[PDB]
Structure 1
Amino acid sequence: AQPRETWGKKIDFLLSVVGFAVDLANVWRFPYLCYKNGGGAFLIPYTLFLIIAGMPLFYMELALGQYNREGAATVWKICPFFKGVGYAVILIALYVGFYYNVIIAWSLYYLFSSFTLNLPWTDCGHTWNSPNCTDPKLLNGSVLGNHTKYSKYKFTPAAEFYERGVLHLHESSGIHDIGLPQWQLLLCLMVVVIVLYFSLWKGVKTSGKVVWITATLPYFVLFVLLVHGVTLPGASNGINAYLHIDFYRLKEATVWIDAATQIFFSLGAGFGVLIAFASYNKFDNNCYRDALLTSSINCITSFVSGFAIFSILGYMAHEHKVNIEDVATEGAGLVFILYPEAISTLSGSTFWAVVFFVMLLALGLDSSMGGMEAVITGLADDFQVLKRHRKLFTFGVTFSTFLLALFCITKGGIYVLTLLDTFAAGTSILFAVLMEAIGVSWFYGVDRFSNDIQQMMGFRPGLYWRLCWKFVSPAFLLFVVVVSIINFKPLTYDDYIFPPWANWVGWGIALSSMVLVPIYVIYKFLSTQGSLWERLAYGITPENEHHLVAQRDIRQFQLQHWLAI
């Protein structure tokens, strides 16, 4: 009943997409995974794979969002047998909303604690840094250590602080006894959801202004951190270890599939955020150059974050008289346990720590805003009533996210966080992108998509894009699923071992999504009236062209549609 909330400037759309793509996984996971699989020789399988897993699919979604001007759920009007895939992604970006706002609360506790001349992670004592009875010592200032991994050593002050204070993992023993939510984490999550609501209460009108600071400050932070790190003793060793080209790392499962998963999870394709952001652009906008630029900027950001992180790791290895392979870390530990440990060593640690934690806050906040905006836009385009009462809908979404995140802020919330992240994110987003690629390239057809893009922009996509859409991307989005299913390992923490029922609950969530897609399939199949072929023709044809089912001219049954390149 009103024109759609088009972006005021395309710069806002670009900044939003970049802030969604750039994530903490580019900071903590990209450098370690790059150094593990041959160092610099990790880039050769990366970019090529990146190209596929980065260029068509993203473009496709963008093009989809540009052509089918709707949310993630109701974007499948061209093929009604895949709207469940539009539902699952909305649930996906919801499951990634429960635990990823707890990681933002972790960057706010550290920010509040950094407003002190003496940082708690510097040394031992009752600056909170809740200590264990088992010899809370100094890293290297007073006593040394031998034959131990500095990454997982939990007896340093910067490693005791994080766990014991923020997570209170000592008070818990596993997911069987989660305990009670931390009141400090509760207040941090309240502040997080409050700023999320205040940034997403009035639509993309506010988010396009917030992404100006949220998507540009981390770049300046990383630049200043690199400038400071390059002028540090021992950082050159870590930098040389980072870009150490080992071309003899030809093992497939170790390098290739890992790089593919890294690119696919870093770029963010499969949460509905891309379709939601592209549904707010003008019909004449060029989404091809936008997708290419966003992918290149994401890769450059990951590369410079890896440079900074490995310079810090080399500085730590030189200052602690240890090798660089030991300080190599990935995950929340590298950004919360090990990086503040290095920040505390340099002079003026307050400014560096405050800036680093504000950057960490912004990186998570942009991705959370993108995910919540995608969910809200999808559920509003699915049911138009919620589109009118956007304030109450956003408030309800944020409150449900806050209430369902209490299990991730409790004494044993890190276990639930890891379970949700791994199982939900991996399996759900893999199945979702596989179904999306199949539906767009086989049921709707690559020829129709190319014609839609030609209607959008004057230039038609080349043969390479269609070949990657139809035969390459669906082949590299099913191989990864088979590898993840076959090479699945039981859920394991640093030392804690998850009982079988936790893994069964994770696989139950995965299967819930992967049946909810066929649940909507069979729902659309049964909710129709007619014969078998008549029912099948109302789910593989465009809805706006459903009258063609009455005229009985269906091309999906024809061989030319399946053989169209």
Structure 2
Amino acid sequence: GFILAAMGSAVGLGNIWRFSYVTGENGGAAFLLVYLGFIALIGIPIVLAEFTIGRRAQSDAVGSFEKLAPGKPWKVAGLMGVAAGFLILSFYGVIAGWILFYLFNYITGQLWSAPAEGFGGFFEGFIANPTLPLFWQALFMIATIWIVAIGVKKGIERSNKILMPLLGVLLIALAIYSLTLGGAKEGLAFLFSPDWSALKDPGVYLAAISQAFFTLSLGMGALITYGSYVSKDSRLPGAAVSVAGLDTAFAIIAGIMIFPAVFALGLSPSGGPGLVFVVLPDIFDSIRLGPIVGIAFFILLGAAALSSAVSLLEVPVAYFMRKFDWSRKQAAITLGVIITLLGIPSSLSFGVLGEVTIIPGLNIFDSVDFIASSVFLPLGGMIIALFIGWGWKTSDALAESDLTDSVWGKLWILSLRFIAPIAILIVFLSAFQ
């Protein structure tokens, strides 16, 4: 039921866009290994943790901590999630803006054939433009603010009820097609033959733990909100697995679509954020009716991004209504404008503001992404796990998580109580050296 809504949030640009350029510049299979290891040992338990919290509390993220734990400082994760909601959405609307621009050019037929400067140069010229991405960012943000304020979200999960299975099938089709382009052995080995020297590098673990929290909509309390509006019929840990498995499925299939085509096109896997925006247009170009494939793919991906951005904007909006007694439309608009303003310099980091560094060695886009995804999400996720692991009580924890008198229940508690917090902790200390 409402578990589909959680998948609507989980599956988005993190599965196709982010997963690609993070996996690419981090070795590939070695990264993927750690990534898959984190979803299992850290991801799924914490996803189940957020479901458990919301379902008992029957409230929003930050409100859940106060109801379950009045006055206790456990709510610092919820507050940290609010800040992450601002940061992540700020640049998320920028990448989603890129999708709408690419959608437009397939509608006008400008991307049907390769431009004079090539698809790479086309994307370069677009993001180097100071004001052209800003329009499409605003256009996407306005649509997000619109849906959140009006509260019309059944336009959204009737969408991910049809459009998301369509996205999955399309990706499966494109993944198979990409393997025929002549870079299959190079692509699969990159993705599934681990380089053990990369496991020497602590930064790989931090990138994997970041992608894990990002792709699962985890660490900021977005899933806590979904869990509150889940009836008690529903076995939560099956939901947590199904959510994690489906999202993992979307990402891995996307990798099989991208990287074989990357080596086929003779591109670098460490290309950057615009990797997919260079590969896909040429794949579609190799297809005779590829413009139609292109139009369909960016309509579907845009839908997935929209349903994820609504999920993102909801976290600060729901908070500001609980704390400052704002109306839904007021909160959505005000925060919407602020977040969009916050996204402008981030979008300019691909152009005239490329020289600016905030985090040492990282531009504005990478800095915001770092602070939100590599710091806030796993730190907040740690606190959430610690909350159930130590702050809760096993009897209540297992009761809500539908894992009473089970071996999985003890295994789940063990994850949240030690294995997950220590793993995130170890990654932190090793990375910050």
TM-score tier by shorter-chain length is 0.7 to 0.9
Aligned mate of 2:233, from 284, 287, 304 = 284
Q: 1:205 to 1:120 in 2, by over 3 A?
A: closer
For 1:190 and 1:248, the matched residues in 2 are separated by: 43
- Name the counterpart of 2:16: 27
Matches within 5 A, 1:6-405: 10=1, 13-30=2-19, 45-77=34-66, 78-79=68-69, 80-119=72-111, 122-124=114-116, 157-168=118-129, 182=131, 184-200=132-148, 201-202=150-151, 204-230=153-179, 232-242=180-190, 244-246=192-194, 251-253=199-201, 258-317=207-266, 327-329=268-270, 331-383=272-324, 385-386=325-326, 389-405=327-343
Higher relative CO (Cα under 8 Å, sequence separation at least 6) belongs to: 2
Root-mean-square deviation (CA, aligned residues, Å) is 3.0
* 2:41 counterpart letter in structure 1: I
For 1:338 and 1:290, the matched residues in 2 are separated by: 34
CA contact (8 A) 2:237 2:401 kept: no
Structure (1 or 2) with the larger CA radius of gyration: 1
CA contact (8 A) 1:73 1:379 kept: no
Measure how far apart 1:354 and its partner are.
2.0
- Name the counterpart of 1:412: 352
Measure how far apart 1:270 and its partner are.
0.6
**Mind listing any 5+ residue stretches in structure 1 that lack a counterpart?**
1-9, 125-155, 169-180, 318-325, 487-565
For 1:240 and 1:402, the matched residues in 2 are separated by: 38
Measure how far apart 1:446 and its partner are.
4.1
Q: 1:206 to 1:340 in 2, by over 3 A?
A: closer
Q: How many residues align?
A: 417
Mean Cα displacement is larger for which, 156-165 or 278-287?
A: 156-165
Q: 1:416 to 1:213 in 2, by over 3 A?
A: farther
CA contact (8 A) 1:214 1:362 kept: yes
CA contact (8 A) 1:97 1:371 kept: yes
Q: How many percent identity over aligned positions?
A: 23
**Mind listing any 5+ residue stretches in structure 2 that lack a counterpart?**
355-362
Q: 1:394 to 1:213 in 2, by over 3 A?
A: farther
Higher helix share: 2
CA contact (8 A) 2:209 2:378 kept: no
Q: 1:35 to 1:111 in 2, by over 3 A?
A: closer
- Name the counterpart of 1:142: none
Q: 1:32 to 1:379 in 2, by over 3 A?
A: closer
Q: What TM-score, normalized by structure 2, do the two folds share?
A: 0.85
* 2:83 counterpart letter in structure 1: L
Q: 1:275 to 1:57 in 2, by over 3 A?
A: same
Q: For 1:19, what is the secondary structure of its paired residue? A: helix
CA contact (8 A) 2:235 2:401 kept: no
For 2:206 and 2:346, the matched residues in 1 are separated by: 29
Q: What TM-score, normalized by structure 1, do the two folds share?
A: 0.66
Measure how far apart 1:43 and its partner are.
5.5
1:131-181 C-alpha deviation (Å, 9 max, x unpaired): xxxxxxxxxxxxxxxxxxxxxxxxx5323222323332xxxxxxxxxxxx6
